[PDB]
Amino acid sequence: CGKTMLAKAVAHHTTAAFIRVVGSEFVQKYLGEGPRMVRDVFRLAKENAPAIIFIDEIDAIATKRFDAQT
Amino acid sequence: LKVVSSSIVDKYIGESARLIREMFNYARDHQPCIIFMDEIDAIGGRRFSEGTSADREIQRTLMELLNQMDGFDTLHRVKMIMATNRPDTLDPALLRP
Amino acid sequence: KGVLMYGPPGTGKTLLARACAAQTKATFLKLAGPQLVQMFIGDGAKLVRDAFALAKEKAPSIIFIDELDAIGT
Amino acid sequence: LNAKVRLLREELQLLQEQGSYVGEVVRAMDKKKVLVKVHPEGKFVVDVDKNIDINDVTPNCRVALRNDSYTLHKILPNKVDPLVSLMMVEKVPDSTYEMIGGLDKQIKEIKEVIELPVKHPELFEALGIAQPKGVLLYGPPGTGKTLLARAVAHHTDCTFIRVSGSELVQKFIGEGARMVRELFVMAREHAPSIIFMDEIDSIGSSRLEGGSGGDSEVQRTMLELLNQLDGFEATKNIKVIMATNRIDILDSAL
Amino acid sequence: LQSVGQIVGEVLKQLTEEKFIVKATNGPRYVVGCRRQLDKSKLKPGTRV
Amino acid sequence: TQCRLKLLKLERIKDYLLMEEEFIRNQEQMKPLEEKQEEERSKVDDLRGTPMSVGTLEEIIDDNHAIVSTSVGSEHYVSILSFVDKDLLEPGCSVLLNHKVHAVIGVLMDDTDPLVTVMKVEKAPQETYADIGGLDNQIQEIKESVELPLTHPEYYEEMGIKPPKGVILYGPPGTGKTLLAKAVANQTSATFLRVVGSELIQKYLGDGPKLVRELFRVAEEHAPSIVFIDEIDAIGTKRYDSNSGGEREIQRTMLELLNQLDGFDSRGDVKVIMATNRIETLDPALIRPGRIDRKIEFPLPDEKTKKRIFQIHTSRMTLADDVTLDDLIMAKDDLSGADIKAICTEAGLMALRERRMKVTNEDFKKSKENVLYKKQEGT
Amino acid sequence: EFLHAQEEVKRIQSIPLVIGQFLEAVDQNTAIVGSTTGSNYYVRILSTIDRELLKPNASVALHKHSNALV
Amino acid sequence: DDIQQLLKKINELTGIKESDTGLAPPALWDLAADKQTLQSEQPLQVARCTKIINADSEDPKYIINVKQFAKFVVDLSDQVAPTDIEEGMRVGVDRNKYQIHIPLPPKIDPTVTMMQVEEKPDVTYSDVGGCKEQIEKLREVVETPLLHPERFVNLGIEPPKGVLLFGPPGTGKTLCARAVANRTDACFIRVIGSELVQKYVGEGARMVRELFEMARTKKACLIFFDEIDAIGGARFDDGAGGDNEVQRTMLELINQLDGFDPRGNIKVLMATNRPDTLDPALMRPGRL
Ligand SMILES: Nc1ncnc2c1ncn2[C@@H]1O[C@H](COP(=O)(O)OP(=O)(O)OP(=O)(O)O)[C@@H](O)[C@H]1O
Ligand SMILES: Nc1ncnc2c1ncn2[C@@H]1O[C@H](COP(=O)(O)OP(=O)(O)OP(=O)(O)O)[C@@H](O)[C@H]1O
Ligand SMILES: Nc1ncnc2c1ncn2[C@@H]1O[C@H](COP(=O)(O)OP(=O)(O)OP(=O)(O)O)[C@@H](O)[C@H]1O
Ligand SMILES: Nc1ncnc2c1ncn2[C@@H]1O[C@H](COP(=O)(O)OP(=O)(O)OP(=O)(O)O)[C@@H](O)[C@H]1O
Ligand SMILES: Nc1ncnc2c1ncn2[C@@H]1O[C@H](COP(=O)(O)OP(=O)(O)O)[C@@H](O)[C@H]1O
Ligand SMILES: [Mg+2]
Ligand SMILES: [Mg+2]
Ligand SMILES: [Mg+2]
Ligand SMILES: [Mg+2]
């Protein structure tokens, strides 16, 4: 419909910091490095206020199910 | 690039997203470029919203692929030809005009 | 490229590949259908690719897959 | 001045020990040995330094740990309890009786059912009636069924546990299958407590099918388990509240 | 047999004029120094070293 | 009598033992025997070393060597050291390896189960039989199936007949199945496990049989035990979506229960008590004679029985004088001892809205009219 | 010589350092950090450091093999 | 009081508690453990061979795949003849110089399967009635070929392998097997139908696979699949992969009693009560 359409516009006129992250960049190979990757993107947004953070897809991040054994 | 979709799927704690992310990097530099993907059905399932870890694990690499086609970082001289024998199973957002 | 053998059970499908792989002497690669289903993503894909690559190193080879019902529809 | 500068010249040598691992005490042995779980690794049974009593060690508190011999160097300051934390991952934002208004009649009734049996248990033992546990609210979504429940627990002064089953809580609590009484293990430690449901179908009639009773497990057990749960029946501090939209649907067993 | 190997990482972000912040192959990030025979303009957040 | 004629010889056995130990300590190193033993035990904490790494015993090699898995999962063919009870070395057991040498110093710890804290109960259920009113047949076969064989195991042996193995309590809801369960948990002082029939369905496939396996194992470790299964219907009627494979996975869960309830594996001294109110929906093979032996049924109470129940909950109360117990009983009909206690409880509560202690004949009218709409509404 | 000691400290800040993440104070010079090696640590803090740039969730440097927050 | 003095002094001159042993013999064990520290090859870090580069060459090489999951080219043993260690074989190596030393004890994989082995129950063949063909059929095919294998090879036949027991519940399908279980005096490995239903895709099939790997080594076993209906199914397609998991485990069981695999000499009991459900390819002679 124009989700990524409209945020793409809002990222031209925003006249502020605009930190764009891909949904899956948050995962990665090295263990524990996910949490440290998150903390970073907020401590960077914090310093550079005013800022928009825009995650393109939250389907790998906040899913409803979790297998505790894997 | 001739890419059988069953080969870019491996088991290393979210490594299978790298090849898609990578396979695209490679294309941007050497552009012009064609990426062909044979039997896209391997990593282009539906969604599920109930499956096991194996399934939530391919659902990432797909979601990844789907953002390297139309996120912000628009593609320029890159062409991609998918091929399948069952396009009823493909995620509607991968078949989206 | 390859022949299928289908029919009722016990009619002698598995008996013909036994006899085939012992009378020809070529490189005959024994593989059963449920040995390819692994719990770790893609590992079952890797074993198939390895099988065919090990058949090219030893060529001319014969890969007899038993129980194609472990990879349904 | 001499003392100060003496410290700073000596410091450069103090900064050479390889540091210290922070594990957490799992549980103590008797031989002045403690079972400690080193964060990124496995577990180690270890000696304790003499200066820290074996009585200050307590299962679940955090401990330093020497970078070589692994003795209990010093007890760290930060105890870690999940029910204290988990509840902050549900963000159910507690309010006051000043916020729920236009109910009144309802407010006064739950006070006779939850406030009195917690505060004055002597009134039911004196009257000669058993304390009530199950309390079912119900009305169209967004009429303050949760808003009141949050409050009642705030003035009574009990821990408030939103139960939802989400796997996110099961990292804080334990293992799915056995996880029922496993909740009562955390309620009992912080008793008095009000375990709280949220019977779905506050969004549709697809929550009343395809599965056939999805959140009516969190109470056909909790409640069946809450007549004969350990020796807590003597002092009954653990109530339970569920809230639907339609009172006709409940499973007849409820 | 006299050569050795060098660890491949990336330049995450230049810090001062001489200290960089590079990430290893796995994770262990470092504040590191650098050969003064390198064009400090090519090192920039993103490149491999 | 004879028992001290036995003592007079037991002591001599010990006095002799004292001769040997008292002389061989001083022959050892002119010191007490526990002081030489303590020289050794401190020296064993030199061997043992500190720290002690927990691990997993994967397999034993007869040669007093064993392949263990440290935290990392790396396996090591180590040696089984001094001061180890090799009879505490089963697979899956936690062992104490040397942090440095990696050799099993032993399983010197009481490895815990968090499933027994759920299944077992350290109860004191107030309700004893004598608080179960007027259901008296029910109160007994049970005693002949559970409590009596533990009190008087000489009757069954003298007759020459095995005691009956398991019971099913079944009837209309409310009649007193779980109340009988409370009664017998109280008394027998066997370890009393309790699992609701619903808890035998959980999200992930396959766990059904696994939870069922580990429930009996717990009850076997603690024999003599009682394993009550409250509402075994819920396994086979209500479902929850969470489970995969649907009804087929429900079956394999049941087939596991069904085996480890009879099966092949030579168990013993674990009574079983299955409550239910839908008995007609149970796989017969589950309740096959020789799997469960006695099917007590709980009919709705009579009229004179229904009066002993309504007379038992009111006993802790103070009723006003205008209360006629016999008018409120007959007023309604087809009451379960759950409905009776529900009318008593409500009315007593109406007295607590007024700040009194006399349940009046009108408190019971309001109550009886709020449990009847309760039974009439929400049906 | 107070100045000398401040010039003499420096050596501990010798490159190369291991970036880690500060977690919380303990005493008036000891804190809990977490290397990007995965582990946690309870280390001395180097005297003479802006004591309260330290808190939020700030990036810090630890001294390779001793882990001192320098 | 005096028997209590007995226990008092017993403890005063032995003393045990939450201590790992009885402490009576292990005091000398201690002095053998000081020889276990000198045992420097120990600890030995365990790995598995995967590929022998050279064998006829003067210098055999191997490719060890250890548990840190990095792979090494290594030397041969420092004494053990290089004929003993083939590829696949699990083998222990030294941790300093990854030198292969001690061949194993392979197929660790058996962890759950370990526990299926049996320790003789308490029922005998007299405690069973209806001793017609019923029990004389079964002895004939499962007990007699293991006690007197000379009379089947002199005639020149080969007795039949598997035996299916089926009947209404409570008619002695298990009893008649509790029976043969002890009197047979040959390795007895019963699996409970439901314990082969696992959580992860094709873990069930692994279970079966490991089960026969273990039974082929131990020369002459019984396997007694009790109450197979789980993993006893019958192939069928409909909808979304119904029982596709369990079904595939069965194909593995089928496949290992009839594939190419000659197989050692292991008999197999299967006691259902619902034979109507078993897959035809599981039921026909030459497997049952
Ligand atoms: N209102 C509109 N006006 C003009 N063009 C539109 C409009 N909506 C969508 N488009 C066009 O259609 C495309 C689809 O929109 P967009 O790419 O933002 O999809 P999206 O909603 O981000 O999809 P996804 O769900 O895959 O993230 C745009 O790239 C743009 O070309
Ligand atoms: N045509 C035949 N001639 C001689 N013997 C036969 C013949 N067919 C079957 N047999 C005998 O029957 C046995 C079983 O046949 P076989 O194992 O080949 O069945 P299959 O069709 O491979 O099994 P499935 O359909 O169950 O995978 C053989 O071991 C063989 O001794
Ligand atoms: N025959 C009875 N005599 C005395 N009290 C009774 C009787 N029947 C029921 N009660 C009272 O009702 C309460 C609940 O009854 P109980 O738990 O026995 O119901 P149930 O038959 O187990 O119901 P369900 O089918 O839901 O399990 C008991 O705690 C008890 O006080
Ligand atoms: N022929 C028999 N002789 C003596 N006892 C028998 C006989 N048949 C059955 N029984 C009795 O039945 C009891 C249970 O039988 P068993 O469990 O072996 O039946 P089953 O076929 O295994 O049933 P299920 O399908 O429920 O496992 C035995 O303990 C035994 O006492
Ligand atoms: N009686 C009330 N007084 C004040 N706010 C109310 C009232 N009823 C509803 N609300 C508002 O609506 C929100 C949702 O109501 P609530 O009952 O908590 O949700 P639910 O639909 O789950 O019952 C409340 O958090 C509150 O902001
Ligand atoms: Mg988009
Ligand atoms: Mg065949
Ligand atoms: Mg009940
Ligand atoms: Mg049986």
Short mmCIF file of N, CA and C in Angstrom, two decimals, chain F residues 132 135 138-139 169-183 275 298-301 309 336-338:
data_model
loop_
_atom_site.label_atom_id
_atom_site.label_comp_id
_atom_site.label_asym_id
_atom_site.label_seq_id
_atom_site.Cartn_x
_atom_site.Cartn_y
_atom_site.Cartn_z
N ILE F 132 -16.65 -36.04 54.63
CA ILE F 132 -17.43 -36.45 53.47
C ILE F 132 -18.75 -36.99 54.00
N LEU F 135 -21.83 -40.04 51.64
CA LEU F 135 -21.29 -40.91 50.60
C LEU F 135 -20.35 -41.86 51.34
N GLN F 138 -18.81 -45.08 48.48
CA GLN F 138 -17.66 -44.39 47.91
C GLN F 138 -16.47 -44.42 48.87
N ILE F 139 -16.64 -43.94 50.11
CA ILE F 139 -15.54 -43.93 51.07
C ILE F 139 -14.96 -45.33 51.16
N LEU F 169 -12.83 -42.94 39.95
CA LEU F 169 -13.97 -42.25 40.54
C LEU F 169 -14.67 -41.47 39.45
N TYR F 170 -15.93 -41.79 39.20
CA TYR F 170 -16.64 -41.17 38.09
C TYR F 170 -18.09 -40.92 38.46
N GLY F 171 -18.59 -39.76 38.04
CA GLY F 171 -19.96 -39.40 38.29
C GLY F 171 -20.26 -37.99 37.83
N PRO F 172 -21.48 -37.53 38.10
CA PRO F 172 -21.85 -36.18 37.69
C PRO F 172 -21.02 -35.15 38.43
N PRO F 173 -20.73 -34.01 37.81
CA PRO F 173 -19.81 -33.05 38.42
C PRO F 173 -20.36 -32.45 39.71
N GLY F 174 -19.52 -32.43 40.73
CA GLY F 174 -19.83 -31.82 42.00
C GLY F 174 -20.05 -32.81 43.12
N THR F 175 -20.17 -34.10 42.80
CA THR F 175 -20.69 -35.06 43.76
C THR F 175 -19.70 -35.41 44.86
N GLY F 176 -18.40 -35.33 44.59
CA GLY F 176 -17.43 -35.56 45.65
C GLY F 176 -16.22 -36.38 45.27
N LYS F 177 -15.88 -36.44 43.98
CA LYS F 177 -14.71 -37.21 43.57
C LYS F 177 -13.43 -36.61 44.15
N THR F 178 -13.19 -35.32 43.88
CA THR F 178 -11.97 -34.68 44.37
C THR F 178 -12.00 -34.54 45.89
N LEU F 179 -13.19 -34.50 46.50
CA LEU F 179 -13.27 -34.46 47.96
C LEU F 179 -12.78 -35.76 48.58
N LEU F 180 -13.13 -36.89 47.97
CA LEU F 180 -12.55 -38.16 48.39
C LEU F 180 -11.04 -38.16 48.17
N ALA F 181 -10.57 -37.48 47.13
CA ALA F 181 -9.13 -37.42 46.90
C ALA F 181 -8.43 -36.70 48.05
N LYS F 182 -8.95 -35.53 48.44
CA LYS F 182 -8.41 -34.83 49.59
C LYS F 182 -8.35 -35.75 50.81
N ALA F 183 -9.42 -36.50 51.06
CA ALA F 183 -9.50 -37.34 52.25
C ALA F 183 -8.34 -38.34 52.31
N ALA F 275 -9.89 -39.57 38.59
CA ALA F 275 -11.19 -38.94 38.65
C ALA F 275 -11.58 -38.46 37.25
N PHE F 298 -20.19 -42.21 41.89
CA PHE F 298 -20.63 -41.18 42.83
C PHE F 298 -21.95 -40.65 42.32
N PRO F 299 -23.07 -41.23 42.75
CA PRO F 299 -24.37 -40.67 42.39
C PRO F 299 -24.67 -39.42 43.20
N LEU F 300 -25.50 -38.56 42.62
CA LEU F 300 -26.02 -37.43 43.35
C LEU F 300 -26.54 -37.91 44.70
N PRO F 301 -26.40 -37.11 45.76
CA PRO F 301 -26.81 -37.58 47.08
C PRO F 301 -28.32 -37.80 47.15
N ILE F 309 -25.02 -33.32 54.42
CA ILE F 309 -24.04 -32.41 53.83
C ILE F 309 -24.37 -30.97 54.22
N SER F 336 -25.53 -31.22 44.14
CA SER F 336 -24.25 -31.81 44.48
C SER F 336 -23.73 -31.16 45.75
N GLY F 337 -22.98 -31.93 46.54
CA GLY F 337 -22.31 -31.37 47.69
C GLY F 337 -21.49 -30.13 47.37
N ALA F 338 -21.29 -29.83 46.09
CA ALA F 338 -20.70 -28.56 45.69
C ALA F 338 -21.74 -27.45 45.67
#
